[model samples]
Target chain A: TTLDRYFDLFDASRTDEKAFDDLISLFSDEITFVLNGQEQHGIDAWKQFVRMVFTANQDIKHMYAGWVPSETGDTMETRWAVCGKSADGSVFTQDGTDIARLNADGKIVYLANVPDDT
Target chain B: TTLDRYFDLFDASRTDEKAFDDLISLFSDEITFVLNGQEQHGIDAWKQFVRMVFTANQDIKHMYAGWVPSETGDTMETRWAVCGKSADGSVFTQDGTDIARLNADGKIVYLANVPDDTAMFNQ
Candidate 1:
């Protein structure tokens, strides 16, 4: 299906790194991930950063967020909320969004993360 | 009225750095500009980087772009096209988009740039 299991795979990774294996597969080998404002290249590096996130927040949840198709048939967009608790007994929540453009093979070139008023 | 002349200020700066002065004013002093995946914080730093862009491309043009308000009334979004000739006689064009959030003072807190296929400027 065109809508990949992005969030489910992402959340599942918190418990097992293998859960994110397929999530990374959807992206091209040289995919670029713009988290917040920092540009990170390649899947391995991206995985390392996300793995760090999962480690910090052991109680994060996901909603299997889907992609929003672009009019040019070349891009997708999505925004969602994240809720989690820290290992230090603190809770946090935030909203984020990004737009991604895919190649002919349906591999993503980059995902730009947009910050909000929060 | 909320857009606050972002595009005009941006394009005008290509010829005069002063044009971007007001552009920087629209953003918070501690604004975060997420450009092409690179994070730049504060007005002076952002201005320095964008000034470099204007210097590199002497003939850049803009469409007086406007900002789109978020449904939740907390953020803004915009996408536009840029075309111009590089100093070395190269034709350059790109489609760029970003989503920004505003602070209580109506200043931009952050703007994250979403890139396209040729979003990189490696010349």
Candidate 2:
């Protein structure tokens, strides 16, 4: 099901390059993604940004918290946290609530990372 | 009905003295409230904290963005923002997503605010 695959996609995000490939497969070709206040179009741009974040912060780890779907069930908001060690060997953690909207075919078309107050 | 009343509660938060009193009537006596990393138990404590915030921040205003309910309908998460003029006339705003859990009587019992990244306050 799409829901199960969505969960697997997040799980594989920080695992390895081969596993991270699932993101390319899950998102639509013309996806609209927002990361750290930057608007990006297409899966390649989204993948590049994710790779940059993980590269700067070593040992990146993601923790899945909770999620809720919109009344119409077309939108799902998932709350999660990511942490890793910085260049100076300091640990940093950030909490995010991401909204993912699915199209008629259940492909993610719009995804935005909601900014956290941290 | 409960959702409608809940929306009204936030709308009344910074209106005036009388309107702010709705917080007391809507929350359970044994409510668990957490604000700024401080854990407070009971409605009186919660009211006191809210009052303190309004007192320090002049012309406080609250903007409700959206809300989503849990799968079982027992809990609701509301995203909102609060901005005001500080004592020194500096404007400041904070974005928050609050989780509210209702008791059997449909009164709020557990409330904790989740921190926001602050970069994106709109949508």
Candidate 3:
């Protein structure tokens, strides 16, 4: 039930822009994301960067692998795997980690993520 | 300066038994260690388990590559690369991720680790 909203945000039909917006809406305004050791803070900055990356890469697929909820019921950590094929069918895969905290209203207030080391 | 003690604990001269004991001493009494998704709780259980593993694989070496401290200053996440040679000289290497939390006295209170993805290190 904790991750039910997350699944809705990851709808396959959404465009990259919409997806980024949904990601922002899913977390707190102060969410932080770490990619390959680089940090992106706040919803707007994080979404803008994600938009750029997905725009450039068009065919990327991000899928969740495991979701572990913290004992507090307000936080959840997830493991994810991403796979995709280019226009010419070249394939790529990557893994990632994420921690999300929920506010009193059940909206995510803090989110932190790191890409899997490769 | 924060990691100076960690470096000393990894001294090459230390025997495997001593190394495991040292690891226990460096943590809190309720320290928890997670490896490959399995959890080992408390100093005694963790040290005993590590002793068995090191005993079975006498040449394994665990090395830390990057140590990133959390904003709280009480936790650190590290990237590690492990390499070892068997008695017969067969070399093996692996990458790992670890998060360590320190107690008030600077001892590690919790340690969580996971092996690096296969793609991270192709054979």
Candidate 4:
């Protein structure tokens, strides 16, 4: 399942060195990632941001909630939460939705994160 | 066409006095509304909030995007944008998703608004 695979990647990213490569493998070379109100193209940009997120947080945990598939069947929206602590020892939890579009090869070609407003 | 009716209610809300009663008609009498990190129950609470929104904004337009029905077919998530001018004369547009669960009578029983970070109105 895509949700299980996504959660596993988050778990692996903290300790598994190979997880970096494996994570990017889920996305296409031409992936479009939207985060923090910015639109970035290609895998390099996505990889750099992912590295930053994982590096900034400690003991990150991804909790799955539910998912909805678009009528077209090419896109999916997954609702989940990311829980972790910052370097200041303060823990935080954020719920958000991931809107992902897959390519013909079943690799994600576009991914956008919609964080719930606090 | 739940999405269409939803949008129409938004449009009618701004101008039609009867829209107040009509809008709440779409929901069950036992509707549960969660907004701004608080849990609210019943149509009266929901109606108060709706009244507040309709009174604040001007020329509000509800734009339809798309909707997704849950696997169980009883729940639906509608994506749309609300564009309008505020009292400050600054026009704004915000995107959000409305997660609605329908009762046996097809009236919405539970509703939550997942607004985009900068959303202004509840629509």
TM-score of chain A of each: 0.83, 0.79, 0.68, 0.87
In candidate 4, which residue pairs get closer than 3 Å at backbone N, Cα or C atoms, i.e. clash?
none
What is the docking quality class of candidate 1? incorrect
i-RMS, each model, one decimal: 17.3, 15.2, 14.6, 15.9
Return the top candidate by lDDT: 4
* Real contacts recovered, all predictions: 0.00, 0.00, 0.06, 0.00
Winner by TM-score between candidate 4 and candidate 2: 4
- Tell me the lDDT of model 2 at A76: 82
Model 4's interface RMSD: 15.9
lDDT of 2 by residue, A72-109 (tens): 75688766545444544454455566788877787788
Candidate 2 wrong stretches, greater than 4 Å: A1-118, B1-15, B71-74, B119-123
Candidate 1 regions with alpha-carbon error over 4 angstroms: A1-118, B2-4, B64-66, B70-73, B118-123
lDDT of 4 by residue, B36-61 (tens): 45788998888888777767765555
What would the TM-score be for candidate 4 when compared with the true structure?
A: 0.47
- Lowest summed lDDT across 10 adjacent residues in model 4 chain B is found at B85-94
- Residues A12-97 of candidate 1 have per-residue lDDT tens digits of 87777587777777778787888778888987887788778877974665322346775675678765545555665454444456
Candidate DockQ scores, in order: 0.01, 0.02, 0.03, 0.02
Put the candidates in TM-score order, highest first: 4, 1, 2, 3
lDDT of 3 at A69: 81
Per-residue error (Å), model 3, residue A89: 36
